[PDB]
Structures are given as structure tokens and as C-alpha cells.
């Protein structure tokens, strides 16, 4: 205290106005709130200690084992479907799943819930929306920025930091918001031009949204556009990490189209392999010009951008809902179909699925997501329950010899090299 008196710089704040009010709810608010939040997690931690100990290190030859650990769901939100799932770039523990309503004929309000790994009893953040949220995404540079896509094409921007929880930005008829439903929404990595928002509507008009002050500016990147009436419907869109200009957009028609930001009215290439609408198209990690697409027709196909046809096609009796590449290692992907989730590694097996599991018997899986930080897969049920399953240690990169050649470059180069070698083998077979 004497030292503070000696040096009167930045006098301590936190003036004791406090809460007062005498009775009927004195104090019980910010320093005390942190203690209560810590206490709730500690009580949950003791009960879930057996599960928590297994999650930290249970440690799960061509075999795969998947174990569901916890399921997060709300009885009130049981009608809502899981739909889009995302993980904050800044914190591996925080992942947000935005509930949405499928089947079209039945429409209900969708609640966006961010579930922290520390507390699984209830969502860390709860958001109420007029219509079900089709897609939810997090900006890579800032965890707080959140992109939300809802029915009637409304685009919602939410900041986690804001206490009020009202949408930071919205899309209106004057802002040229697209019609139908925006199935896929993504955040552009580049921050030079403020913040760029990419949204693909059911009508089929790629929309680029730039954050402004009390206003949003929308720019149409491309038009889906043949003896047919109206614009082609697009159910998904993805941007190659290696090249920003080239982006792949899926369509309801069933033909995947590679697109370039520079040419609004031109298509770089078109793939006619799929016979039904492709639910999700994603570029493979650690390699360029390669991607995996999941379609309504129950087949999963891996394509090469240079080629006009899918290099490998996987047939599943149950309809395929979505396919996601593994962030940790290339040539690893997970497909969830009719309560069955299957993970395939090209090196481990040419065609046979390494592992097949059913995390929840009662509900169909709306969507599945992959965590970059650890080998944990999030699966979303039809009832909105979200369950995370940790993958086995049998599948790993640089597996022929452990710690062989000591190549730091190989983690981001040998994986790229391995897919090319695998790709060459497919060409020889065909």
C-alpha cells in the first residue's frame, strides 16, 4: 500500500458502488460470477472424472476403434436438427453447433449453442434466431466473429464478447439478401479488405459480404446458371486454402463446379460424376487440386481438379449425408450414413472402411465435423444431440517407420507427396 502511495500512477479502480439493494438479490454478480462458473465446472468434473480421465489419455494392425464420450442435447431443442457444426480457431475446447430445421415442410425457430469442453451440462452461449440456422462458421483471425445462415437467406453476424447477444449485423432486401436458404456460409481468411463473408443460397448466387460501420455491402462472386428454367440450386461451396481465387461450389443438379473469383460469369471446370445433389464438397488437407464430395445419391467420390471424373468412388448402401477430410493427416476422411460413421485411410485400406461405429442408436446423423487440434470427431444427430467420438491411434502420418529420417518438412511435404503416389496408382489401374 505504501509503494502505491509513493507511485500515484493508474489509481486502482473497481470503486465500491457494488450492487447493494439490501434484500432480494444483493451482489451475486462479476468477480462472484467467475467463482460460481468455476464451482459449477468443479462439481461436474468430480462426477465426470471417470469419463474425463478416459478422455485425456485412454489410448483408444489395420483396425479402427471409435468411442463416443459425451452427448450434448436439450429436450426443448429436441425438434431442432444439429445441421452445421464449427470449432473456434483460437480455442480447441470451444466448438459451436447451430441447430436448424430440416425436411422443409416443418419450420421452427433455431437456437445456436456454443458448447465449451469444460461444461457439457448446458451450452456456454445460447442464441435465439427467428428461423433455424442452416450454417454456422468462425473467422480464423478472430474467434469472437461468428457467421450465421438462416431460412429466408438472412445472414447473421454475432460477436461472442457482446453480453447483449443480439446479432452484430443482418442482411435485408435493401442489402440484396438472397432468397430460399443459405446452406453454406464461410469466413474469408484475408483481413486486408476488412472482413469478408461468403454465403451460398439455395437459389444459387455466391454472395461476398464485407463488414462496415452500421452497414453491410454484398457483392455477387458468381451465378450458378442448358434447357432449364431459373438459376441452378447450390447446396455447398468451399475455398481452396492453397489458392484463394479457385473455389468449388456444389449444386442440387448434381454437377460439382470449380469456380474462380476473377471470372464472375465463367466456370473454370465442371464435374458430371455425381447423379444427385452434393451435400458437402471439401478440399483435402496438405494438398492442392484434390477434394472429397458427399452427395444425396449414396456414393462418396474423391476427385482431382485436373481430371474431369472422380479418381475413387465409395459405395455405401445407406444414403451418405456428409464427408469431411482429417486435418491432422491427408488421405483420411469420415462419412456418416443412417446412424453409421465410417473413417477411411487410403494407405491402410484401398476400399474397406478402417472403422464403422454408431455413436447414437436412436437418431440419424445430420452432420459430422473434424477437430484440427486433437483426433476427436463431432457427430450431430437428428434430435440436435451432439456427441464427440475420439479416433484410434492406429491411423497416423509417417507410419512406415517411427521417427525415420527426422524430416520436419515431411509433415507438410511427405503427406502431399504420399497422396500423389496414391493418385498415380489409381491412374495405372484405370
Amino acid at each position: 500500500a505504501e509503494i502505491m502511495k509513493d507511485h500515484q500512477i493508474e489509481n486502482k479502480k473497481k470503486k465500491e458502488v457494488d450492487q447493494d439493494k439490501k434484500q432480494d438479490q444483493s451482489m451475486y454478480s462479476t468477480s462472484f460470477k467467475r467463482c460460481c462458473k468455476i464451482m459449477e465446472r468443479m462439481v461436474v468434473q468430480n462426477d465426470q472424472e471417470d469419463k474425463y480421465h478416459d478422455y485425456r489419455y485412454y489410448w483408444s494392425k489395420n483396425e479402427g476403434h471409435l468411442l463416443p464420450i459425451w452427448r450434448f442435447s436439450n429436450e426443448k431443442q429436441r425438434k431442432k436438427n444439429v445441421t452445421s457444426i464449427c470449432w473456434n480457431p483460437l480455442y480447441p475446447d470451444l466448438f459451436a453447433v447451430s441447430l436448424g430445421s430440416y425436411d422443409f415442410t416443418k419450420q421452427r425457430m433455431g437456437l445456436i449453442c456454443l458448447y465449451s469442453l469444460k461444461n457439457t451440462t448446458h451450452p456456454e452461449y445460447a442464441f435465439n434466431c427467428e428461423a433455424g440456422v442452416m450454417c454456422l462458421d468462425f473467422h480464423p483471425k478472430s474467434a469472437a466473429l461468428l457467421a450465421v445462415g438462416l431460412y429466408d437467406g438472412t445472414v447473421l453476424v454475432y460477436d461472442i464478447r457482446n453480453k447483449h447477444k443480439k446479432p452484430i449485423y443482418q442482411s435485408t432486401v435493401r442489402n440484396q439478401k438472397h432468397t430460399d436458404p443459405v446452406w453454406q456460409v464461410k469466413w474469408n481468411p484475408d483481413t486486408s479488405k476488412n472482413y469478408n463473408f461468403y454465403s451460398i443460397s439455395s437459389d444459387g448466387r455466391v454472395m461476398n459480404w464485407i463488414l462496415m460501420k452500421n452497414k453491410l455491402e454484398p457483392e455477387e462472386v458468381i451465378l450458378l446458371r442448358s434447357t432449364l428454367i431459373g438459376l441452378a440450386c447450390g447446396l455447398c461451396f468451399d475455398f481452396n486454402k492453397f489458392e484463394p481465387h479457385i473455389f468449388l461450389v456444389g449444386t442440387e443438379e448434381g454437377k460439382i463446379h470449380k469456380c474462380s473469383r476473377a471470372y464472375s460469369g465463367q466456370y473454370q471446370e465442371t464435374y458430371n460424376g455425381h447423379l444427385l445433389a452434393v451435400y458437402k464438397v471439401k478440399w483435402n488437407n496438405f494438398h492442392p487440386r484434390t477434394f472429397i464430395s458427399a452427395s444425396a445419391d449414396w456414393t462418396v467420390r474423391i476427385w482431382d481438379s485436373k481430371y474431369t471424373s472422380q479418381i475413387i468412388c465409395f459405395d455405401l448402401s445407406m444414403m451418405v449425408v456428409d464427408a469431411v477430410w482429417a486435418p491432422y493427416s491427408s488421405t483420411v476422411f469420415a462419412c456418416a450414413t443412417m446412424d453409421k460413421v465410417q473413417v477411411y485411410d487410403l494407405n491402410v485400406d484401398k476400399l474397406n472402411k478402417l472403422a464403422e461405429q454408431k455413436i447414437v442408436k436412436q437418431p440419424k446423423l445430420t452432420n459430422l465435423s473434424f477437430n484440427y487440434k486433437d483426433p476427436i470427431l463431432l457427430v450431430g444427430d437428428s434430435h440436435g444431440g451432439v456427441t464427440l467420438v475420439k479416433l484410434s491411434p492406429n491411423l497416423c502420418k509417417s507410419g512406415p517407420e517411427i521417427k525415420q529420417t527426422e524430416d520436419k518438412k515431411a509433415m507438410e511435404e511427405f503427406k502431399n507427396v504420399k497422396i500423389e503416389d496414391y493418385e498415380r496408382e489409381k491412374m495405372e489401374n484405370l
Partner: protein, 151 residues
């Protein structure tokens, strides 16, 4: 006109209370408290009022949720001055004993942490007994104590 005048006065009072509230939804606990303090001329009515004595679900809601959680005997808040702000236990004797005995141990425990490093201050303390686990969260304004049976 006297009644009319009275009505007008009431209206005026109501307006003053609002200001920040701006009518609309019943909203906020903090706002209500402020109104009660500063001006006590008028109270109640105005709008729906949501749920009575529920200014904020989040700290109050979280405390209710932990109490509802299975295997938790109860959560008792201890006032900085050896007092029970809120008590939630099956037997008064256990709550009364916990209310006086637990804070004294935490203060003694805080000093033990304090002796090793002066800058370091107690953030959370957990004592595990053979049959029960005791968790105490200490803050200058309030202390939160929860007893949960080990699984």
C-alpha cells in the same frame, strides 16, 4: 380536476423511472433496483414484468442448476463477514456448522497459499474427505461452498 392531475403525476413518475429501460420488454434486474433506490414514488405494473424476483437468471440460474445436479448435497454462499447469504442443505445443523467452520478453514488455507508467494492469491480450494468432497470458491465480496459426494 384532481384525479386527472394525480394520473398525470403518476405518468410523469413512470417516465422518469424508465428512461434507460425505454418501456418495451420487462427486462432488467439492475434497472429495477436502481429505480427502487433513487425514486420510490411509483412501483409495479408498467408491463408483463416477466418472472417475479428474477432480475437475472445468470448467476441465480447457475446456482439453481448446480443444486439440481445429482450427487450434490447443496451449495451455501458465505458472506465475507461470517454470514449465510443463501443456505441450501437438508439439515440446518450441518448448514449452520458449515456456515461458521468452513470460512475459517479457507481463511487459514488462503494464508498458507499467501505465505509461499505474497502476489499469489487463492483462486479456488478443494478439500476431499473420505466420504465427501468439499469445494470452496473464495472472492473478497462473497464465498461459494459446494459439498458433493465422491462417485
Amino acid at each position: 380536476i384532481y384525479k386527472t392531475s394525480k394520473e398525470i403525476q403518476k405518468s410523469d413518475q413512470r417516465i422518469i423511472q424508465q428512461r434507460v429501460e425505454n418501456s418495451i420488454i420487462n427486462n432488467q434486474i439492475y434497472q429495477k433496483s436502481l429505480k427502487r433506490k433513487t425514486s420510490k414514488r411509483k412501483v409495479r405494473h408498467q408491463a408483463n414484468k416477466k418472472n417475479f424476483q428474477k432480475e437475472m437468471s445468470e448467476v441465480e440460474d447457475t446456482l439453481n442448476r448446480i443444486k439440481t445436479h445429482k450427487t450434490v448435497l447443496g451449495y451455501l454462499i458465505v458472506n465475507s463477514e461470517g454470514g449465510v447469504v443463501r443456505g441450501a442443505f437438508k439439515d440446518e445443523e450441518e448448514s449452520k456448522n458449515i456456515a461458521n467452520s468452513i470460512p475459517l478453514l479457507t481463511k487459514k488455507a488462503r494464508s498458507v497459499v499467501r505465505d509461499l508467494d505474497p502476489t499469489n492469491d487463492l483462486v479456488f480450494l478443494r478439500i476431499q474427505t473420505k466420504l465427501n468432497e468439499i469445494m470452496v470458491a473464495p472472492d473478497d465480496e462473497f464465498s461459494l461452498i459446494v459439498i458433493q459426494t465422491k462417485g
